[PDB]
């Protein structure tokens, strides 16, 4: 995920939505540690024109083995995921999950994902009162070549489940 | 307002080799649904496009 | 450390030095996980003019608690360290260490440091034959004010020790 | 050649707040010793300068 301005929360706007609506904003910083020692770091930045978002995302990866699934195009899909949010302070979301892809040889390819979302203005009291918040994340990717991509996503926030 | 449309410039490097893509998309901020199309502004990516997926929206 | 072009190896030039000598160069990427959840990512880049190096270093940190040791000036020194290098392939150094600072609370403040050095041209075969390579690193910081710093370093590469 | 001198521009953000410093130093490439002086181009750093030390040379 990377445009959480499209994510509503269970009972109201997500903090991402509120920060767009009030024109105060947030920034995103991530570190991703892959099982084969490679890592990716990212910085996501946004500007806005009303209901239109402009993203500038810098993504840097190093240490991927030349014969591994990333450099040899063996990843087949991103597993559905549950992302955990806690709020260590009123301006910061710490987002974590274990990220896994399926691969062509049947093994999963694993990564430990960490993210901070840093807000210019405090998040609302009603956000801060419900922790942890979990997000179910489904994605799809098509690409016929390594040149053009078509991506889709569906996310659902939840703090509870029953049965 | 809540968002309806977006554009993205995603760039950086993998294993020391630069990449750069641009594109645009839409979403439903009441449903958490989004879609995006992206194209390289150079040649094909030298790495799996799936490595970018978590940084797309 | 951040200008390893000044680091010799025990028997000759370091790979960093060889990469400056032919101007083929290398790029540095780092991820640093702090004990209180905060993380730092960095990208270091260089250009060369004769015997003069120009560095452009982008360092991003997030999630530092406002009352933690980084934001309340508790750090008092960086502990002496031993950095470990291995070479997963002929164009890549993976550098690791456990990084600790002393603090005014009489505790240490801990970080897990990971770095890749990615070379444009392969490192020499004689470099690749001696792994792991370790680097003893000592630093000093003088800082009467937070706007004006003086830094000194000494590093020593070793692959062996006897007694 | 081996290096004798260097300049540094180090910049970025901590907890979302930008910082920027410039300076210069020297070193001995036969001994692994280096020295650097840096100065902020804004005001004083809002965080411990020790957090930058690992990224200095």
């Amino acid at each position: 995920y990377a445009f959480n301005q499209y994510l509503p929360f269970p009972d109201g706007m997500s903090p991402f939505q509120a920060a767009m609506q009030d024109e105060s904003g947030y920034q995103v910083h991530r570190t991703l540690q892959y099982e084969d020692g490679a890592f990716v770091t990212a910085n996501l930045r946004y500007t806005y024109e009303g209901s239109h978002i402009k993203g500038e995302f810098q993504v840097i990866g190093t240490g991927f083995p030349p014969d591994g699934p990333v450099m040899t195009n063996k990843l087949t899909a991103l597993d559905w995921s549950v992302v955990k949010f806690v709020y260590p302070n009123d301006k910061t979301i710490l987002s974590t999950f274990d990220k896994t892809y399926t691969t062509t040889d049947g093994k999963r390819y694993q990564c430990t994902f960490r993210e901070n979302n840093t807000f210019a203005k405090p998040m609302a009291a009603d956000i801060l009162q419900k922790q942890p918040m979990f997000i179910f994340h489904k994605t799809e990717l098509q690409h016929s070549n390594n040149a053009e991509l078509t991506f889709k996503e569906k996310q659902t926030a939840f703090s509870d489940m029953k049965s | 307002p809540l968002p309806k449309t977006h554009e993205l410039h995603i760039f950086g490097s993998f294993n020391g080799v630069k990449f750069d893509m641009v594109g645009e998309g839409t979403g439903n901020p009441n449903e958490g649904s989004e879609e995006l199309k992206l194209k390289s502004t150079n040649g094909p990516l030298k790495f799996s496009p799936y490595i970018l997926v978590p940084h797309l929206g």
Side-chain angles (χ1 to χ4, degrees), chain A, chain B:
Chain A
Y1 61 94
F3 287 93
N4 278 1
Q5 304 93 333
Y6 287 114
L7 174 65
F9 264 21
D11 303 323
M13 280 188 295
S14 69
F16 314 102
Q17 288 180 332
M20 176 174 174
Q21 284 276 39
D22 74 6
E23 303 178 57
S24 60
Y26 66 98
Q27 295 169 41
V28 187
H29 183 213
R30 294 170 173 194
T31 187
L32 282 61
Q33 176 60 63
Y34 290 92
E35 61 175 64
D36 51 4
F39 56 93
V40 166
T41 66
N43 291 100
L44 321 182
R45 297 297 187 277
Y46 311 96
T47 63
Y48 304 97
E49 285 178 340
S51 66
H52 185 61
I53 315 165
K54 301 193 182 198
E56 287 285 337
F57 296 3
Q58 182 186 53
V59 182
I60 309 295
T62 57
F64 288 96
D67 64 343
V70 172
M71 302 306 295
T72 69
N73 289 272
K74 303 291 195 287
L75 304 182
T76 57
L78 178 65
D79 282 336
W80 294 353
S81 70
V82 174
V83 180
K84 179 186 178 181
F85 292 173
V86 289
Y87 312 129
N89 58 64
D90 64 10
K91 285 173 175 188
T92 313
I93 306 176
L94 171 58
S95 173
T96 56
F97 69 111
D98 186 87
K99 181 185 80 153
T100 39
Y101 298 91
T102 52
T103 72
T104 57
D105 57 43
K107 279 295 236 180
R108 282 176 158 70
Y109 184 66
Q110 183 279 338
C111 175
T112 297
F113 174 110
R114 301 176 54 75
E115 171 187 82
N116 289 133
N117 302 275
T118 307
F119 286 81
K121 288 184 50 263
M123 296 180 280
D126 66 341
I127 298 304
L128 295 173
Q129 281 159 11
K130 196 86 218 230
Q131 298 185 59
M133 179 63 64
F134 300 96
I135 320 294
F136 203 94
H137 180 236
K138 299 180 176 178
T139 68
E140 300 172 34
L141 184 74
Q142 339 153 29
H143 74 291
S144 282
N145 60 29
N146 267 217
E148 314 194 8
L149 310 181
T150 300
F151 162 91
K152 309 186 215 170
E153 139 162 71
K154 173 65 183 198
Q155 295 194 107
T156 303
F158 65 105
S159 61
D160 199 349
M161 177 155 326
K162 303 296 270 99
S163 80
Chain B
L2 291 176
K4 302 180 192 178
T5 65
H6 64 282
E7 62 186 277
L8 176 59
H9 174 223
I10 181 167
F11 61 91
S13 63
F14 274 80
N15 288 3
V17 177
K18 296 185 177 177
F19 79 97
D20 189 281
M21 318 185 79
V22 296
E24 61 291 303
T26 68
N28 183 341
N30 302 120
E31 289 189 5
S33 61
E34 308 165 42
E35 65 89 8
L36 176 77
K37 284 177 211 166
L38 280 180
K39 303 189 190 148
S40 173
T41 62
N42 191 341
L45 300 181
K46 295 299 216 151
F47 54 85
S48 172
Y50 279 96
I51 208 59
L52 301 179
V53 162
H55 309 109
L56 304 183

